[PDB]
Every structure is written in structure tokens, then in C-alpha cells.
Symmetry: D2
Subunit: 295 residues, 4 copies
């Protein structure tokens, strides 16, 4: 037997950082969960019990804290690139670093109409994420994403004209509820290294904001012919607005809300145009994916 | 042996309702999870296999949907009271109904600065809840709550002057992070029945809003001497602003963020006044409770 | 306003302990999660910011580890009693301690048919729990429980003869699937103090084993007329076999498995006597409770 | 823009099936959660709102139930292959089916030392899984796995001789606790189609059993030099015992249990050879992966 692939590291490293403005007194907090896995010339730790090639996972944990102390942690694309570059430069035998970062929301509180200098609220479970792969001699590949953005519209969604055969019971509809949890990922052009990532820093937050804005507006305004058709429209617009993105991927559950026929009870009318009370379904759910690129 | 207490019913009944304004075209959605347990002269279903006394739990589920179709579902204190009253009036042998309702957030989206007529976002996992106990001959007892409101402040929290003995290692502090998930419950004066609950309908939403507002402002503005001291201040203000509340209860975790000493690494300074990077602790946590009433 | 009730402490304290037999070389592990909340003359910490009355929650955490180092941790009823007694005896102003313990399964592995001296498997998510309330001058109240015991039987469950009215759609049945997660609690006679708890130590493990055995046998063998009827039979037998128990409480979900009519597809027969494929329902579920005592 | 990849289908489809032996009266249950995603000539549903190419996800759900009614559901490798083959054969424009199946444990109860004909217990959260990719013209690729197998050993694990630099604080150790949740995957040789999968049916259950047995024995018996070294030994043995497997992959968290220094309290000795009470750490954790193949 032989080792065909191997990677190892530390997962679920929770990190908080505060910035304190000396002048204004305003404080800003960042909280993330970080995972770092390394690859390189480490096969002998598996095959011969040779621990001399292992950077201990505890040391990786230490490095994440030290790196956060010495560098900005925002935007996460930059922090991930700094952290990954560290490992491949510091250790001769380590040739790839894979860094995943989940950013948690701490939104500044408004009290009596003005922003508070040091108080924050978790205003949603929505996350902003990055996956950064730093590979020696091949640059830095970055995928940025948002996830856990849960939306619903109560009308202006249709679903008709689908294939019907002996396996089909679903009725065509011209008015249904549409609800999903949005997972959207944009993949950047390969960067040659840390200098190039630094040159594009302002684009990272701006592109996240654009992706979020396009997602929400398109969902609200599209008279949706299907999940497939609406998600394509979102991805098209994101690629149009940021030339440094190569592909956009959406993965969307279709979270079903079923009509409840109540006619059995005193002829009560609760279906079609009369539908007011619905039963949300926990499972099963549709799952619709697409990756859109440039032609 | 004898049956000392018994209750039974349906849990985890998910309900959605939409209201459609005919004039304006604006739609508003409500989504809840409902649990209803009944008590009464039902002992023989346990002791003698006598099912004739059982309102089937499936029928309770049907009743929740029918009741939601025929009545407003907001404020939840009113809906819960209507639903509980139904069971005790409809069935001679059922003498108590216990209704719990969890309300999920569907907040109207703003698109290009204006509110969308039919699109919504789950803008937080914070819940608004009610527990309603309808007991034949003893009226209606209502506890209203908010939960899952997660906050953090980065300074203006202290903790010093506590008992020190041979079990104490904790250092006194004049500046720490304070973070919690707020669970706050206000218990109303007993109501004689459904007419009295209806007479107070406008107070329910207003009191929820006040409780939320007082919680957030007090947390942001109090230079906190302890969790105990700050939570007392919140409860005091709520009782002062709504005379129909008899007690307020808070249950608050103290979610710890620990300093990380980095001095072992090149004399790096990251503690006390120099602390920038912290390690959030998933467990254990402090848990602090108090019920405040009128003197 | 006035403090009507208050308690505070540490939650989610994870503890592991190992015992190493010097002779045989056999090791045995225990893992628990512990919560301790105290009550007493502590109102001034809430009302006047007087921290001098507070045993810091960090110190409570320290005490749990020290107590586990110096005492046996099994049976959990004994460990909880020792831990609660400590707080009320050590601190003059603390008059009640409330200790909850969840025990996690680490079952010894059999390798090649024999028991391994030091290797363990989490063979189920089933828990054994205790709640111990130690109140100065009023002794020690102990409730022991098992929870998270998930079972299913595929036949020998019936449900017919229930109340039918204009809210009823459910069909009577003489053969259905029955599945539940068992939560069973037995409450001991009040003990005068730690000496009395020590005198009954052998009864604690034996009663847990009996409760488990009666639950499983009754479920497997009863041709069930309803959840209500079967659970009563379980509780009756437990009270009969241990005179030091005053009450038994069961709380049982009815986790539904629905028939799927497939007749629309080529006349396929999948209902009644022909039912083979079912759809498990995640929600809603029945919830059935009963507390049985001595007559 | 252009569609670069697309797949869609139904997730979280819960299925139960019962087999009833007419002679013996013995019943056997199977419960699974199934996900099916399709690929093919479906781009126009995204780009032109052309629903004529869409097999509705509701119809996929129907097909899973029908297929389970007409075919055996065990071993899951066979059921997944039948289900995937159906879609590519039935629909001309669908060219790939991806089927994931999670099998839940329903273990037959022993009552009074003998096996019960119709009663079952969920004896662990451990799962048996399959991923089956059926691609038109390229056969059937099957990855089988077990997951959620949680183990701990209290001694006979070491970790010393690792790289030490200015980022290292971890002390070398010759005796520590080792605990993990095992995720192991074995990938089969490509099969030409359903006839070939049928020819190997007996190997599927036997190989799962072997993989489980090797995992448990190796973990219990290896005086572990590192997670890396022990996991390699497991994978080596599995490949040796089943020639139809091409690769084995393990993904293993290192779930840390930390010593607690209690010397601050009355010189209490709880570290090194005196360590009895430990603090399990919820996070962070090591994460160690390896894919082993044939040389
Ligand atoms: O938008 C949808 N796309 C689909 O593929 C589908 N299948 N059922 N409902 C559906 N809705
Ligand atoms: O506010 C606090 N109250 C307490 O009781 C406590 N114990 N440790 N830290 C603490 N903080
Ligand atoms: O055992 C049962 N008890 C009940 O009260 C009930 N209601 N629906 N199905 C039921 N089954
Ligand atoms: O087995 C281990 N492998 C590792 O890479 C490691 N790092 N810290 N502890 C460890 N244990
Ligand atoms: Na390198
Ligand atoms: Na009544
Ligand atoms: Na005392
Ligand atoms: Na095809
Ligand atoms: Xe969508
Ligand atoms: Xe607080
Ligand atoms: Xe039961
Ligand atoms: Xe391992």
C-alpha cells in the first residue's frame, strides 16, 4: 500500500479580535472560526511513525492566534492568504496550506437612534466564509461565500410546464410560496501571491456586498419561473459586475410549504385562491445547484 | 398505584398564515410552532385502556389549523387564549389546556430603500414566545417571553469584590467582555377569560417591544458590576412600565471570552491593557437567574 | 420591586475520571456533564451590587473538579449528594444547592470475544441522569432518570375507540408501527442527609437497571392499546419493585410513520395488509405524559 | 455567461421498509435517508425558463418510494445502483444520477436472552452510508462508508518526537487519552453496470463488517505513536482483505482531554502519573486525513 493523499491540521479554532480607536473611543469586534490543514512531505509520519515531519496541530492553533495578533483579520480573504503563506514559507517540507474561515455577525447596536461605541448584537445566523488554498509555486486560490441567508416570498413564484409521466403527481401552479437558504460562492482568478492579494483588498468587501444585494433584489423582484431560472439570473449579474470572478455557484434548497385542505370541516375553503393557512415541511426538500462561468 | 398527574397532546405543529391586503397589495406572513397539551378526566385511558375519553392527538393538530384559519394569529397571547378556551369549552371532560407558541421572525425586506410587498428575510434566530394555561373555573394565565437574543459588549463590564477562599483562582477585573443569550419572561395578572384578554390586546405587542428595548439599552449603557446587578436593573424598569405584569424572570448565560497569554512567543503582549485577541469558550458557562416582583 | 427567587452557578462543566486497577491492569472511565446552581442570602448582589456574597461561578467549577478528585463519581446519586452537601455546609449564607448530572456511555469494547482493559465505545446516545436538590434543614431530594432511549416495534400496536367528532379525520387501526424516545424519571423518598444516602448506595444502580429492563420488556411484549395504556403498565411495575420510590414519571413522543398510497402508480398495493414502505414523519408528534404514585 | 455544471434533485427523503417472514413470524425493518441529484441536458431550464426538461423533484421523491416497494433495499450499494440506473435509462436527456444513502441502526432487541420477532432499539448513532454515481456509458462508481463511530482509549497512546520551534508549547507525552469519531470510506473498482454489481452483492455486507472489525481491533491494540500512524495501519489491513477496493480514506478528529493541575489547592496531585480527573475539550480539535491506495 501507499499514501495517495494526506492532510492534517486544526479545526474549530474560535478567535475573537477587538480594535479600539484611541481618538473616538469606538471599538469594533471580529469573531471567526478557523480551520487549517497542511500538505507536504509528511508520508513518513503515517508509514514509519516518523513524527519529525509533523508540525503539531497544537502549534498550528498557536500560529493562528499569533497571526491574528500581528495582522489585520479583515477582509477574511486577506487574513486567510497571510495565514496560508506563513506555513508554506516557514516550513520547507510543507507545500500546501488550506485555510477555511467562517465569520460570525456582530452588528453594532443602535441605541436611541445612534450607534453605540462598544455594544453588538448577533443580528442573523448568516455567515461570510472564505476558502483559501495556498500552493507552493502555484499561487493562491480563493473562494468567497455567503451562507445561511434564509428568505421567503409569499407570491410571484410559479412552477408549470415540467415533464409529466407515470411517476408524476405534482400539480402545475401559477402562484406558490418560495423559500430557501442561500449558499452562494464566487471564485476569484488565481493570484500569484500575497502582493497581488494585497493589491485587490478593496474589491473583497465590495464584491461580498454586491453578491448579497443582487441575491436579495433578484429574489424579491423576479416573477420566478423555477428555482433554476431565478438563480441563473443572480449568477449572471454577479459575473457582470466583477471581472476578477471566474465562476459563481449557487446551492439552494426548495423549502416546501403545503396547502391544507380543510373542506372536510364545514366546507371550509383553504386551497387555491382561498389558501391562507399552510403547513411548512421540514423534509424532504428540493436541492438545486448550478455553477455559472464566462462564455 | 394511581395516576397522580397526566397530560397529553401534539407537539411541534408548524403553522404558516398569510394576510393579503386587497387594496394595497401588501402581504404579511406569520410562522409559528405550536404545542398543545390537555388535562382532565382521562385517567381511564391509562389505567383501563379506555380510549373513549381521548381526543386523538391528530384531532388536536386539525384544530390548530382550523382555529388559525378562523381567527387572527397575532398577538400570540390572543391566539393561544382562543385555542386553549376552545378545548375546555368544547369537551366536557377536559378541564385544562396548555398552549405553547414559538413565533419565528419573517421581517419585510427593504429593496432600494423601500419595503417590499411580499418578500421576507429571517433577520435573526431570536424568538417571541407565549405559554398560556387555560384552566376551567380559574381563568387564563399567560407568560410572554423573548429568547435567543445574543449580545456582546467589549468593555464596560467589571467583576471584583467576590468571595475568595481556598477554592478561588479567578482574578478580579475592572474591564472584561460581557456576552449572553437573553431569555426574559413576563408574567401577566390572571385574566378571568377570553373577554378580558381581548380588552388588553394592544398591551401585548407594546409590552414585548418595551421589554426588548429596556433589555438592549440597559445592557449597552450599564457599567456592569456583575450579571446579577445588570439584570436586576432591566427587570425593575419593565415592572415600572407595565402595571399588568406581576413578575419578570431573566435567565442569562455568561459566555466567557478568555485572554490568551502570548508572552512565551517573542515577548508578545496580549493581556490586560494590551489584550486584543481572545479565545471564546464554548463551555462551561455561568448561568444566572432571577425573578423580580412587586414589593 | 423585590427579588422573589434567585439562583446562579455553572452549567455545562464536562468531567472525565479514570480508575486504574493496580492488580489487574483494567481501567474504567466515567464521563459526565454537570450543572450546579446555588440559592441563599444573595439578594444584595442583585439589588446593591454587593459581590461579597457571591461564590464566583469559576470557583464552583473548581469545586466540581476537586470533589471528583477526592470522591467516587459513581453512582451519580451519591456524587451529586456529596457535591450539593459541600456547598451548604461550607458557606453559611448558601442554603440550597441544585446539582444536575448527565452521564455519557463509555462501554467497554469486546475484542475477539474478550473485554478490553482500556478501550471503550459510545454504544448509544442514551443518558443516565440525576437531579439532586440539597436544602439546608430539609434533607436531600433525588430524581433519577434515563433518557434518549429510542425504540420501535413494527406491529402489535393498536389505536381504536377514541372520541370522534367534526374535528376527527384519523382512521381507527388494529396494526400500526409504534416508535418513541423514552424519558423515564423515578423520584426517591426524601433522605435526611448524606449518611442516609450512603446507606442506600447499592439500590441506585440496581433500580436504574430495573427501570431500563421493565421499560424494554413491557414495550416489546405489550399488545399496545395506546401509548397511555402501555406507559402505565411500565410505571406500575417499577413502583412494585422498589419501595423507596414515591413516583414514576414518563414523557413519551409518538413518532409517526405514515402509510404511502401508491395505487395511483400501476395499481401498486402499499396500504393496510399490503403496507411495506412507510414515510417517517419528523414533525408534528404526539406527546404523552403521566406521573404514577402509590394509592 | 454559460452553465458550467448543474445538478438538481431531492434531499432528506426519509424511507422505512419492513420485511415480514410468513413462516417464522419474524419482521425486519430498514430505515434510510436518501438524496438523489441528476445531471444531463437540462441547461435550458436555467437559461431560458424551459421546464420541459425538468423531472420534477416531487417525481424523484415518488420514484424513490416506488423503487423501494419493488426492490430489495439491502445491501444499500445494490439499492443505490438500481435507483441511479433507473433515472439514466428512463430519461433520454438525463446522463448521470448521484444517489446518497444514510442507513440508520434498528437493532433487534433481546428480551430475556432471546431475539424479539418485532422490536428494535437504536443502539448507536453510528451510520452506514453509500455514495453511488451512475454515469451513462461510464458504469457505476460506489464509495461505501461508516461514520459516527465514537471511541476512546484511556492509555496506550503516545505523542513525542514532533517538530519543535518558536511556535511550539506542546509537551511530549508517553501516555495520553486518545478519542475520535471514525469516518472511514472504501472505494470500489468501477463496475460496468447493474449486472456486475449484482454479481458482487455478498461482498458488500462482508466488507463493511471487516472494515468495522479492523477499525475497532487496531484502535484497541495499537500502542499508538500518533493518529497518523494508527490510521495507516487500519487502511493497510482493509486493502489487504478485499481486492475489489481501490482506496481507503480515513478522516479522524483528535478529541482532546486535558489534564487539570490542582496543586494550587492543598498540594493536590492530579498531573502525569497522578492524573485522574480530566477536562474534555469541545473545541478546537485536531483533524487528520489520509487516503491509502495500492502500490
Ligand atoms: O423550482 C422548482 N424546481 C424544480 O425542479 C421542482 N421540482 N418540484 N418543485 C420544483 N420547483
Ligand atoms: O457576573 C458574574 N457573576 C458571577 O457570579 C460570576 N462568577 N464568575 N464570573 C462571574 N461574573
Ligand atoms: O397512542 C396514542 N395515543 C393518542 O392519544 C393518539 N392520538 N393519535 N394517535 C394516538 N396514539
Ligand atoms: O496524533 C497526533 N497527531 C498530531 O498531528 C498532533 N498534533 N497535536 N497532538 C497530535 N496528536
Ligand atoms: Na514550504
Ligand atoms: Na371542559
Ligand atoms: Na449553608
Ligand atoms: Na439517459
Ligand atoms: Xe431562488
Ligand atoms: Xe447582563
Ligand atoms: Xe409506549
Ligand atoms: Xe486512531
Amino acid at each position: 500500500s501507499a499514501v495517495k493523499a494526506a492532510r492534517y491540521g486544526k479545526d474549530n479554532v474560535r478567535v475573537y479580535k477587538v480594535h479600539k480607536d484611541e481618538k473616538t473611543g469606538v471599538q469594533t469586534v471580529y469573531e471567526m472560526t478557523v480551520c487549517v490543514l497542511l500538505e507536504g512531505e509528511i508520508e513518513t509520519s503515517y508509514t514509519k511513525a516518523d513524527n519529525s515531519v509533523i508540525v503539531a496541530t497544537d502549534s498550528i492553533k498557536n500560529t493562528i492566534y499569533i497571526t491574528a495578533k500581528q495582522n489585520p483579520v479583515t477582509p477574511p480573504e486577506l487574513f486567510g492568504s497571510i495565514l496560508g503563506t506563513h506555513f508554506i514559507e516557514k516550513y520547507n517540507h510543507i507545500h500546501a496550506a488550506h485555510v477555511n474561515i467562517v465569520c460570525h455577525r456582530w452588528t453594532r447596536m443602535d441605541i436611541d437612534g445612534k450607534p453605540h461605541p462598544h455594544s453588538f448584537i448577533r443580528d442573523s445566523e448568516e455567515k461570510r466564509n472564505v476558502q483559501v488554498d495556498v500552493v507552493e509555486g502555484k499561487g493562491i486560490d480563493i473562494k468567497s461565500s455567503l451562507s445561511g441567508l434564509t428568505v421567503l416570498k409569499s407570491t410571484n413564484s410559479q412552477f408549470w410546464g415540467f415533464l409529466r409521466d407515470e411517476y408524476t403527481t405534482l400539480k402545475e401552479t401559477w402562484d406558490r410560496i418560495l423559500s430557501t437558504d442561500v449558499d452562494a460562492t464566487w471564485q476569484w482568478k488565481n493570484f500569484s501571491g500575497l502582493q497581488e492579494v494585497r493589491s485587490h483588498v478593496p474589491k473583497f468587501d465590495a464584491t461580498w456586498a454586491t453578491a448579497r444585494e443582487v441575491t436579495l433584489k433578484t429574489f424579491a423582484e423576479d416573477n420566478s419561473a423555477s428555482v433554476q431560472a431565478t438563480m441563473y439570473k443572480m449568477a449572471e449579474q454577479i459575473l457582470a459586475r466583477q471581472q476578477l470572478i471566474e465562476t459563481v455557484e449557487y446551492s439552494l434548497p426548495n423549502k416546501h410549504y403545503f396547502e391544507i385542505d380543510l373542506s372536510w370541516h364545514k366546507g371550509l375553503q383553504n386551497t387555491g385562491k382561498n389558501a391562507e393557512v399552510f403547513a411548512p415541511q421540514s423534509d424532504p426538500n428540493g436541492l438545486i445547484k448550478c455553477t455559472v462561468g464566462r462564455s
